[PDB]
Structures are given as C-alpha cells and as structure tokens.
Amino acid sequence: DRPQKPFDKFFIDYIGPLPPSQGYLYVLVVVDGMTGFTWLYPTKAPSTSATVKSLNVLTSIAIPKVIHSDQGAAFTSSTFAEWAKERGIHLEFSTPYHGKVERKNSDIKRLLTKLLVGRPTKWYDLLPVVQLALNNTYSPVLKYTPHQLLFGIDSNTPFANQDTLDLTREEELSLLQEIR
Amino acid sequence: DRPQKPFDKFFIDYIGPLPPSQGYLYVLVVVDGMTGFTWLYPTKAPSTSATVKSLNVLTSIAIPKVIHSDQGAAFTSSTFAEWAKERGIHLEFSTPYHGKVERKNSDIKRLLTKLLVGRPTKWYDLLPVVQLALNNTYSPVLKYTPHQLLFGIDSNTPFANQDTLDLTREEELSLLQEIR
Amino acid sequence: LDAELDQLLQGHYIKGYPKQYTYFLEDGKVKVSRPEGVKIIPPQSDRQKIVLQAHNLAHTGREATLLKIANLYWWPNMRKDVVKQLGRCQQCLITNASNKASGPILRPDRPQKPFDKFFIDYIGPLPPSQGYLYVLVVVDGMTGFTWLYPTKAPSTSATVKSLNVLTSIAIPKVIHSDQGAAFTSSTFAEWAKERGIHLEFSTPYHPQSHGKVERKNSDIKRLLTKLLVGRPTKWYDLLPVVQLALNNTYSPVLKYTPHQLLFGIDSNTPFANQDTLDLTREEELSLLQEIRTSLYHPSTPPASSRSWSPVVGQLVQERVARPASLRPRWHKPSTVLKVLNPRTVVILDHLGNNRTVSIDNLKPTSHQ
Amino acid sequence: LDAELDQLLQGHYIKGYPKQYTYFLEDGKVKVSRPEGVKIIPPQSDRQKIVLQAHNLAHTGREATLLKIANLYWWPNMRKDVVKQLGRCQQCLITNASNKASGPILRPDRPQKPFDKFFIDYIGPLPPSQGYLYVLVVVDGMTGFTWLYPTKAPSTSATVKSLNVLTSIAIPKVIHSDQGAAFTSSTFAEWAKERGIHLEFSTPYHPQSHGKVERKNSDIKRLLTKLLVGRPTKWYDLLPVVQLALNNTYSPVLKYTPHQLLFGIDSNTPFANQDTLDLTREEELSLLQEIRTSLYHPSTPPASSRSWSPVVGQLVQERVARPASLRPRWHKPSTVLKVLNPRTVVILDHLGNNRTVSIDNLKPTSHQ
DNA sequence: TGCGAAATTCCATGACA
DNA sequence: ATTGTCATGGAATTTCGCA
DNA sequence: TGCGAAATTCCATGACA
DNA sequence: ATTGTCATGGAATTTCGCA
Ligand SMILES: [Mn+2]
Ligand SMILES: [Mn+2]
Ligand SMILES: [Mn+2]
Ligand SMILES: [Mn+2]
Ligand SMILES: [N+]
Ligand SMILES: [N+]
Ligand SMILES: [Zn+2]
Ligand SMILES: [Zn+2]
C-alpha cells in the first residue's frame, strides 16, 4: 500500500447553529486527513448549496480525491453528489450514528467556544486567526504542525504558546449567563 | 557688385477696391524682384493692419531683405515701419507720382479683369489658380518661368497655352453692362 | 487502436514503439516501463481526445501541454500530436502573441524633386487656442520643407481650405497620408483629381509608413513645448514662428536646412548662409541640383535574428486594431495573395476582401 | 574682447588663433580668411550673445546650432561655447529626450520560501461582471502560486477583505506592491503592522519592479480571453477556474507547476503527476526542499552599447509622470544622493525631497 | 563509436503594466 | 527608502534506438 | 611623417504616431 | 493597392596646426 498524502481525503462537517455573526450562523469544517490542515467557511445554513458555494472556493486551490462526511442532509443530497462527480471527487460516508481528525474537530469546537464567549457575535472576524492557530499547533504524534506538513516549511506565525483552551472562572459564569 | 537673387527685394502693392468676394475687397500683390514670382493675398482694406496680417503669412515662408512700395498710406505708417524693423527688413519707397516687375503687375491687373468678368464675385476662389498661371508663365527675357527660377525645377502645372489675356467680344459688352 | 496495441502485447515489433522496453496489460490498459516511470499507452483512437483535454486545461503551448500528458501517458511522437491540436485551436491562434519579429525596414528613395510628394497628417487635439484644436502638417518629401495650418477639426473641409492656400505656390504630383476619415472621403478624392494630384495611402494603422511627417510632428511639438515653458499653452500665435524656425534649421546629417533644399539660397533670416553670394542665380541652381542628388541615403538595417518575411500563400493573421477588453488581439487566419514588397502584402481576409497590409500588423500563423 | 583682437590685427600671436591665416579690419569688424570663406571674428564679449541667438532660433543642439553660427563667424573652440549654453538652456534640458539607455536589468533572487514575499496588484477596470470591475492578484514570489479576488474598486477596504481571506492560510513576511492609493493608505499600513507583515513598495511608475505579478496578469487576461471567445465577457464566474488552471500549469523552464512548488504534490486535478507515489510525505518534502533550491535563475544581461549607470552627486532628471499636452517630459535637474543599487537611486529633487527612483525614470543631465 | 530522428533545451519576442 | 518576468514555438543541441 | 587637440562624423536612443 | 525618420550628444575617427 502507498503512503498517506495531502489531498487524499478531506473531512467536512458543519458546526452550528451559532449566534449571528455578520449574517452567518454555521461553519463548514474541512480538515485534510493526512496533514490535519483545517479550512473554515462561514455559511448561512447547513445546506447543499452553502456547501457547494464554500467548497468551490476551496476546490479552487486544491481538490481532494475523496470527501468524507457524516450523513448530514447537505452531504447526501444528489445535487452534492452531482457536484462531486463533476470534479472526479469520490464521496465517502460514515454509517449513521457511529484518530487525528476526531481530535482536530474537538480542538475546533473547543477553541471556538473559548473565544465565542465575551464576544458571541464577533466570530466571523476571528475565523482567520482561529485557522492560523489550529494549523500552527504542534501535533504530539507527528513531530510537525499541519502547516509544516502541507508546505514543507516553518511558518511566520508560530504559536509557541499552547493555551489553556479550557474555560476560566470568569467565562464559565458568563457562559452560564449568556445561555440563560 | 553681387548678382541679383530671390528674396533680395519684394515689390508689394494693392489692387482694388474690387467687387465683394467672400467678404474681401482688395489684393495685396507681392512680386519677388529677381524671380518675378508672385504671391497674392485677399484683404478687406488697404490698411497697415491688413498688410501686416498678410505679410505675416508670407514672411513665415521667406523673408525679403528689402520691401519696395509706392507711398500708399498702408506702407508709410509707422506701425508698418516698426513691423519691418522688427524683422530686419529695410523699407524702400518710390517717389510720389513717378522693367520685369512693372510688366508682371500689368499681367496681374489684366488677368484678373479677364476672369473677374462673368463672375465678378467669385475671385477669392480663383486666386490660387491665378498665381499658378502667373508663376508658370514663360518670361521672354529669361529662358525661364518664375517657378523654375525660384525652385530650380520644372513644375507639375506647366501653362503651355499662353492665352489671349485680351477681352473678347462677348466680354467687352458685358463689362460695359456690369459697370452700368 | 486495439489493432496496433495487440501485436505489441505478445512481443512483436511495431514501427515507433522501441523493442527494448517491456509492454504489458494491467488494470485493463496497455502499459510500458520507461526510465521516467510506468505510463499508460492509449490506443491511437483515444489520443486526440487526450491531447485536447490536456491543452484545454489552461490552453497551454507545446511543452506545457506535453508535460501534462507525459504525467500519465506515453506514445510515439507525442509532440507531433500536440502540435497538431495547437494548430487547430481557434482560441490559441487568435489570442497568443507572436514570437517572430518583422523583417528589416525599407528605406524608400527620397523623392527626386520638391513637390514630387507631400506627406500630410494632423496633430491634435491640442489645448484650445483661439478656438483651434488641430494642426495640419504638410511635409515636402524631398526638402523636408513643412507647412503648418491650425484647424478646428481634422476634417476634409479644413484640409481642402488649407491645401488651396498652399497649392497656390505649387501643385504636388502625389500626396501621401494615412487612412483617416479626412483623407479617404470622396470629397477629398475629387478635390485631388480636379488638380492632377495622385492620392497615396499608408497601409492601415502603420504610421511608420508616413514616417517623414510623423517625425516632423515630434519637432513641431518639441519646439512648441520649449517656447511655451512657464506660460499658458497659447500655441496658435506660434505656428508661424515654429514653421519658419524649423524650415530654417540644419539637419546635421545633410548639412542643409529644408529651406536651402527648397530654394538653394537662405532668405533674410538670422545667420543666413552667404557661400553663394558671387554665383549667378543660374550657377546657384546648378549647384543646388547637384546638392539634391548627392544627399545621404540610409540603408536597410540587419534582420533581427528571428524575423519572418512573407511568402505567397502563407497563412498569416492581421492584428485587431482597437480590440475590446478581454477580446483577442488577432483576426482569424488568412492567406497572402501577393507580396508587394518584403514589408507589404495583399491578403484575402476569409470574408474575403483584398486588404493591403504592413507586415508589422501581421503574424505568421503558428504550427503551419 | 577689444584687447585680444588688437594684438591680432598687427600680426602677433595669440593662443587659439592659428598664425598661418591672415586677419584684417573691414566694415568696422575683425575678419579672417578661412578655407570655407571669410568669417567675422566677434570679440570674446559678444560671443555668448551670439551662441544664444543662434541656439534660440529653434532651440537646436550642438551641430545644428554650430552650423548657424559658422555661417557668419569664426572663433577658437566655438563648440565649447555652444555646449556651455546648451547646458544652461532650462527649456532644452527639460524638453529633449535622452539618448543614453538605462544600465542592464537586475535579476533579484527568488524568495527562498513560500510566503516570504507576495506581489500584489489590481487588474481593471474590466467590463462589468456581476457588478465587479477589478481583480486583486496575489502572487507568491517563490512558487508563483496565485490567488484571485474580484472586487468593485481597487480600494484599501476591498484589499483588506481579500487578504483576510487569504491570510487565513498563512501570513507572509513581506507584501510588495506599487505606490497606488490602495496600498499606501495608513489603513493598509496598520492592517499590515497588526500582523507582522512588512510593506515593500516599488519605485514610482516602474511596474517592472513588481514584474512577477504584472507578468501573471498577462496570463490571467490571456486565458480569460480564450475562454470568453464568442461569448459575452462574463469573467466573474471564471476567476476560480482560471486561478486553478494557472496554479496547475507547468513553466517549461522550471519543469514545475506553481502548485507543485507550493505543496510538493499534485491534488486531484487532471493529469496529476504521480512520480512520488511511493515516497512517504516526509521523503516527498525532502525532495521538495531540494527542488526549491535548485530552480533556474536568470542572469543579468549584457549592457547595451550606450548605457549609463548612476554615480553619486551626478545631475540627473526624473521623468514627468503624467505630463500635460505641450509640457516638458522631464523635471528640472537634481542630484543623486545615494546609489542603492546600479538600477535604483535616491535623489534630492531641488524642492528638495528625498525620492527613491528607478534609473528607467531617469536621464543624466546633458553637457555636465 | 556512428547515424537519422526524436527529445529536449535554448532563447528572442512581446506583453503585463 | 530597493531590484523585471516568463509563455511561446522554431532552431540548435543533445539523447535515444539501433547496430 | 608624427603628435596633441580640435573638428567632424558616426550612430544608438527614443519619440512621432 | 506599397515602403520609417531624424535630432540628439558622447565616442570614434579624421583633420588641422605645427614642426
Ligand atoms: Mn455533522
Ligand atoms: Mn499703390
Ligand atoms: Mn499592474
Ligand atoms: Mn500622426
Ligand atoms: N523606392
Ligand atoms: N537579491
Ligand atoms: Zn488553445
Ligand atoms: Zn534651448
């Protein structure tokens, strides 16, 4: 068998709904399987059309051989199927209700929640920095960050500070206050 | 003494008034002394200002050392004197009431009168052809036309036909009719 | 296709496929183990489509197209097939630039006499001066002697009014101009025939062709500019001054002023040359005739290392004149009917009209 | 003046006036019989005025000025005096063209890493497409990998919106651009500092300086044109197609696509190269690092036979940028403070401001 | 250790401003 | 205070296939 | 039948379109 | 059915002034 490579498999999923930020409610999450590199796209709905609109941007830069997703409605539509077929992307579904990617999605959910508190509405603007953080975050398994693995170089934004990522005392109380 | 040359002396004079042609009444006549080459300019008056306006055109092409004229008012004004001085043109006057040039001025007066009859009012348009005629007219004294002498070449409009220049029967009668 | 590829799999020899490499079946396709790696050999019947898909990704030329194909494939003489398609891509043919330069310029003979030929052209529009916006520039081919007339428009009518004033002096054999509205109008044609003047036109969009006047425009503007430094651009009153000034300026290479070339003697202007003071006019004119024949004549320069010269029946393309944004810079291919001179041709433009055209506005269609 | 010319008339020797010609008085002036003819020798005190009157007739250069003078005059070393005046004619100095070419271009080193340097620029305006008129083009210096963003204006704000989307991926060390309003605004400066990005600017009116992106603009328009042949110019929907298409096209000289130079592996696009199928990512990246260092680098070409290179304290003149009609093409003379490299300088512009400037927008002031 | 043809490399030309 | 670039397609040169 | 300096000629560069 | 041109100012080359 041939070694795992970037663009072999993209893992996509939605996160939301979230509080309205500049008209957006959801986040399409794309994680490259081999590298752990993450792309994020704000959408207004977890719909096939919002998925195609966002993936069109991404697939303008690089095209996966396989896309993997859960059986969300946006991903199982035959519009989305037609879209993938047009680009020679094979579609791959985890069976309903059932590694490196899983951890990354945890990091994303958690890191969002952290910064989403105090400013639940300003997240749109924060997406770029969230990605940069995620992608220059050191992987304990591999000696490298996703940036390094994607591009074969060090980055000009190293996140030397690994952070709490955990919710402090002031935040737990004002997250219990916002969601009232 | 040094031989006579073109631009040594211009002989100027007015002819008119004439019948109105496109707003013009007079003709400034410039004949180069050595060559017999003639320039004609329509004016609205035999004034210093009309003379300077017309001579400005001519003196944009070539400047005489001397201008010769009778003691017409247009030529004896100190405006006209100032004008000549500015251009290093010496002015020269025949004494009041008193060769090749003289004959040329005759030709001009006569040739005008000829074509001026039947169309006393269309002379403005005819000035170009009148000059071309005058200037490609063979001189009995010299073996050459003024064109040849000016430019050292044959012309593309030779006037092989020397004409009556005299007033025919039909014209004498309708010149005696126009001037009634 | 399946015929040629069959004999190959058993191990017999086909022309083009080198016998020393091993060819095999795998995954349903004919393959081959080449130094670079294992490539699929498509059936002859599939090859055009492949070259085409490759080329169409970014409409790439020879090598950049080939490198895409060679990633997956090998077959004999791949580039021959690549070049075949490039030659048939309408879009590449009319959009790409040329990479062959025109042949070396001609230096036509100087008109033999004053008034043999005039070059005429308009300058402008210029900043308004006394309601005037253009200058008509008339340049005598032999002498360089130049006449300037201000106009309100580059119109036929203003052209005729000016040339009537000028032709009072002499009538020219020929008047050469560009294909502007003002010189191609029937009214102007009639005005010329009326006088025995032949109209000569430059090939379209090639002012090099009337280079004499174009070049004189440069001096006219240059001197106006200098005289206008730190004053408002009131050029109308300076036309007569500029005309005179230029007509009486030496060309260092000729050692004569256009005035001298026209009259063989200076008029009463500053620094008049006096060398012929003691000659009779007739002696003067005789020395003038000699001066006129012996003027310096430039020679045609060396060809650039990668030029082309037009050959009869060659496919060539005319440059689009005023191409709209994001539209091709070249017309569809067309055929050279006649080679007038090495720098000028007649083409049948596929409409098809006969057009006379400069090679500077042409490229030789690529890939035969 | 009258001193020098006195000793001469009696027949004694003065330096400069050759003793073998005979000098005499006549008509109130000192004359001399030279092979060409009899010329007046003006007093030293009259000479400047003469040269000046001659030069001013048509503001002529060395020879054409001299030939006017030589018609009436002779004195020692006439051209030295002619050149003195040419050097002091404000009007000639700021209006004439140069006749010395720039020194040979530099070929700066390729950025060592992706994201070391971006070149950015706007294309447009273009025919309206979905209300969009411009394209922001971002080109990675090392890879050539290019990002395209449609905008409504070449504004700072639209620049920031696009670069926020792009810098989601990575942040560059440097971003190089021209001195357009959109990149020189303080808002953009802050946006960059905010992120640790250094702003680099091209010298003014010298797009050669950001040649990488200018050149990429050419491919972008060329491919849009081809894809738009015989359809209405709806380019908005094609930006993503063009971006991808170009990022995955081979440069024949490099033998790589910008995509490969950026990722060291093709993505799922037509004709993906498969050569590194059996290597581990880590082996792949190691071969990438090697490929990146060994890319072809062009060398500086030969100087043209008549170039100039700037020397400190030289008088030079900057070209006027958008010169009005009939106005000079050059600024007044100015001094070279510092020679940054042989093709770039700092000048004190007589105002005087320090300006950094390309030698292409410069001429060396004539006649010292 | 050499030949004819194919493959590859060279590089002038022009177009982005 | 900063700096030209590179697709293109014939020609020139090198390499390949074969003895 | 020769030297130093001045004069002249050569010619690349660029700008008219 | 038509076609580049020529001012410019440093450098290169020729000529001049003198022995
Ligand atoms: Mn889901
Ligand atoms: Mn009178
Ligand atoms: Mn640009
Ligand atoms: Mn023109
Ligand atoms: N000719
Ligand atoms: N560099
Ligand atoms: Zn194509
Ligand atoms: Zn001047």
Domain boundaries, chain C: 5-97, 98-105+304-365, 116-249, 250-295
Give the whole-angstrom CA distance, residue B39 versus residue B30. 5
CA distances from B6 to B35, B65, C87, C263, C268 (A): 6, 10, 67, 9, 10
Tokens of D138: 């971002």
Separation between the CA of D110 and the C1’ of F17 (whole angstroms):
40
Give the whole-angstrom CA distance, residue D285 versus residue D305. 46
Give the whole-angstrom CA distance, residue D317 versus residue D329. 10
3-state secondary structure (DSSP) of residue D176: strand
Helices (H) and strands (E) in chain A, counts: 7, 5
- CA dihedral over C146, C151, C157, C161, signed as positive or negative: negative
Q: Which residue of C has its CA nearest to B67?
A: C268
Which stretches within B68-145 are classed as H helix? 73-76, 78-86, 100-116, 123-135
How wide is the angle at C-alpha C192 spanned by C-alphas C189 and C198, nearest 5°?
Answer: 95
Q: Which of D37, D29, D41 is nearest to D76 (CA)?
A: D41
Tokens of B43: 């004016």
Give the whole-angstrom CA distance, residue D316 versus residue D330. 10
Domain with B89, as residue range(s), is 1-180
Contact C164 B128 (CB under 8 A): yes
Tokens of C171: 């009538």
Q: Which of B175, B174, B131, B115 is nearest to B28 (CA)?
A: B131
Question: What's the one-letter identity of residue A102?
Answer: E
How wide is the angle at C-alpha D23 spanned by C-alphas D17 and D25, nearest 5°?
Answer: 135
For residues D62 and D83, the answer to whether their CB atoms sit within 8 Å is yes
Q: What is the DSSP string of D278-305?
A: TS-HHHHHHHHHHHHHT------PPPPT
The crossing angle, in degrees rounded to 10, of helices B78-86 and B48-58 is 20
User: What distance in angstroms lies between residue D325's CA and the mean position of ligand 8's atoms?
Assistant: 19
How wide is the angle at C-alpha C57 spanned by C-alphas C51 and C59, nearest 5°?
Answer: 80
The crossing angle, in degrees rounded to 10, of helices C78-86 and C62-70 is 130
Method used experimentally: X-ray
- Chain D partners (3+ C-beta pairs within 8 A): A, C
Chain-centre distance of CA B68, in angstroms? 13
Give the whole-angstrom CA distance, residue B62 versus residue C169. 13
Give the whole-angstrom CA distance, residue A91 versus residue A64. 10
CB within 8 Å of D198: residues ≥ 6 apart: D173, D174, D175, D192
Tell me which CATH code domain C5-97 carries: 1.10.340.70
C127: left (phi over 0), alpha (psi -120 to 50) or beta: beta
CA distances from D30 to D18, D42, D71, D82, D250 (A): 15, 7, 16, 21, 79
Give the whole-angstrom CA distance, residue D109 versus residue D212. 12
Give the whole-angstrom CA distance, residue D241 versus residue D360. 37
Tokens of D49: 């005025």
Which stretches within chain B are classed as H helix? 48-58, 73-76, 78-86, 100-116, 123-135, 146-151, 169-178
Sheet containing strand C134-140, edge to edge, reads C146-151, C134-140, C117-123, C174-177, C198-201
Q: What is the DSSP letter of D336?
A: E
For residues D311 and D367, the answer to whether their CB atoms sit within 8 Å is no
CA distances from D227 to A68, C7, C58, C91, D134 (A): 33, 42, 9, 8, 18
Peptide bond into D154 cis (omega under 30): no
Long-range contacts of D341-345 (CB under 8 A, 24+ apart): D341/D106, D342/D103, D342/D106, D342/D309, D342/D310, D343/D102, D343/D103, D343/D105, D343/D106, D344/D203, D345/D310, D345/D316
CB within 8 Å of D230: residues ≥ 6 apart: none
Choose among C167, C264, C269: nearest Cβ to B152.
Answer: C264
Chain-centre distance of CA C275, in angstroms? 43
C271: left (phi over 0), alpha (psi -120 to 50) or beta: left
CA distances from A26 to A15, A20, A31, A180, D291 (A): 6, 9, 16, 21, 41
Q: CA of B61, closest CA in chain C: separation in Å? A: 6
Element (H, E) at C38: strand C37-40
Question: What's the one-letter identity of residue A161?
Answer: N
How wide is the angle at C-alpha D140 spanned by C-alphas D135 and D142, nearest 5°?
Answer: 155
3-state secondary structure (DSSP) of residue D34: strand
Q: Which of C26, C41, C45 is nearest to C74 (CA)?
A: C41
* Fold agreement (C5-97, C98-105+304-365): no
Give the whole-angstrom CA distance, residue C248 versus residue C146. 10
Please give the CATH architecture assigned to the domain spanning C250-295. Answer: Helix non-globular (6.10)
Q: Which of D187, D206, D10, D175 is nearest to D102 (CA)?
A: D206
Domain CATH code at residue A119: 3.30.420.10
Give the whole-angstrom CA distance, residue B159 versus residue D317. 58
Residues on D contacting A at a C-beta cutoff of 8 Å: 113-115, 164-165, 167-173, 196, 240-241, 243-244, 247, 259, 262-269, 277-281, 284-285, 288-289
Which stretches within C210-326 are classed as H helix? 211-228, 239-247, 258-263, 281-293
Give the whole-angstrom CA distance, residue C168 versus residue C273. 28
For residues B113 and B167, the answer to whether their CB atoms sit within 8 Å is yes
Contact C226 D92 (CB under 8 A): yes
CA distances from C140 to C268, D90, D331 (A): 22, 32, 35
Q: CA of C203, closest CA in chain B: separation in Å? A: 26
Tokens of C233: 């651009």
CB within 8 Å of C230: residues ≥ 6 apart: none
3-state secondary structure (DSSP) of residue C130: coil
Does the annotation list D46 as a binding residue?
Answer: no
- What is the resolution of the experimental data for this entry, in Å? 2.7
Share in percent of chain D as helix, strand, coil (round to 5): 35, 20, 45
D109 within ligand 6 shell (Cβ under 6 A): yes
Count of CA atoms in the C-beta half-sphere (13 A) of D272:
17
Tokens of C273: 């040359």
How, if at all, do strands A26-32 and A9-15 pair?
antiparallel
How, if at all, do strands C29-34 and C37-40 pair?
antiparallel
Give the whole-angstrom CA distance, residue C250 versus residue C244. 12
- CA dihedral over A22, A26, A27, A28, signed as positive or negative: negative
Q: Which fold has domain D98-105+304-365?
A: SH3 type barrels. (2.30.30)
Say whether domain D116-249 belongs to CATH 3.30.420.10: yes
Does an interface of 3+ CB pairs under 8 Å exist between D and B?
no
Chain D residues touching C251 at Cβ < 8 A: 64
Give the whole-angstrom CA distance, residue D160 versus residue A123. 17
Give the whole-angstrom CA distance, residue D24 versus residue D40. 10
- CA dihedral over C234, C240, C243, C247, signed as positive or negative: negative
Contact C250 D63 (CB under 8 A): yes
For residues D112 and D78, the answer to whether their CB atoms sit within 8 Å is no
- Strand G: list positions under 7 Å from protein Cβ: 6-17
Give the whole-angstrom CA distance, residue D201 versus residue D175. 8
D130 CB neighbour count, 10 Å cutoff: 10
Give the whole-angstrom CA distance, residue C50 versus residue C24. 21
Strand partners, D200: D176
3-state secondary structure (DSSP) of residue B55: helix
3-state secondary structure (DSSP) of residue D26: strand
Question: What's the one-letter identity of residue B135?
Answer: N
Q: What is the DSSP letter of D243?
A: H
Question: What's the one-letter identity of residue B8?
Answer: D
Interface test with A, best of D242, D265, D276 (most A CBs within 10 A): D265
Q: Which residues touch strand E (CB under 7 A)?
A: C 63, 66, 70, 76-80, 97-102, 304-307, 329; D 121, 123, 207-208, 211, 214-215, 217-218, 221, 252-253, 255
Give the whole-angstrom CA distance, residue D365 versus residue D362. 9
Contact C233 D327 (CB under 8 A): yes
For residues C142 and C110, the answer to whether their CB atoms sit within 8 Å is yes
Instruction: Write the burial class of residue D215 (CB in 10 Å: 0-12 exposed, 13-18 middle, 19+ buried).
Output: middle
The number of domains in chain A is: 1
Question: What's the one-letter identity of residue A165?
Answer: L
Q: Which of C246, C18, A176, C68 is nearest to B61 (CA)?
A: C246
